[PDB]
């Protein structure tokens, strides 16, 4: 998932036997972006991740981009000033 000036935008995936493609479903999100981050699971013949975006306003946002319920925000936020960074990780033997 990459952005441009704007926001919630293009995925630009690939083909599992071939080359790249895209989704033309965009939200375009009045701008508000400082950071985005995600993480991917060791299984997954599907999308199989979660989106977290950080906004210029005092807000972050997590969006599940599974094809059912795509570009639809899932749960909300609170932060005091500005994030400038995000990360998703799993560390045990809950996605932190």
């Amino acid at each position: 998932v990459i952005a441009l000036t704007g926001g919630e935008l293009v995925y630009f995936e690939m083909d599992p036997s071939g080359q790249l493609n895209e989704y033309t479903e965009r939200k375009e999100m009045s701008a508000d972006v400082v950071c985005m981050s995600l993480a991917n699971v060791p299984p997954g013949e599907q999308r199989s991740r979660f989106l977290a975006v950080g906004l210029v306003d005092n807000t972050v946002r997590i969006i599940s981009l599974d094809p059912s319920d795509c570009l639809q925000p899932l749960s909300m936020q609170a932060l005091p000033a500005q994030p400038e960074s995000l990360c998703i990780v799993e560390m045990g033997g809950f996605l932190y």
Binding site: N58, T59, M76, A78, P80
Partner: protein, 33 residues
Amino acid sequence: CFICRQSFQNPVVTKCRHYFCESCALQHFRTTP
């Protein structure tokens, strides 16, 4: 709602049953965390 006493403009929740309107509770967090 019952902070702004409006209609339920995204009546959305916190940890502990507190359903507030969305941008109004964002402004509430701007008031007190």
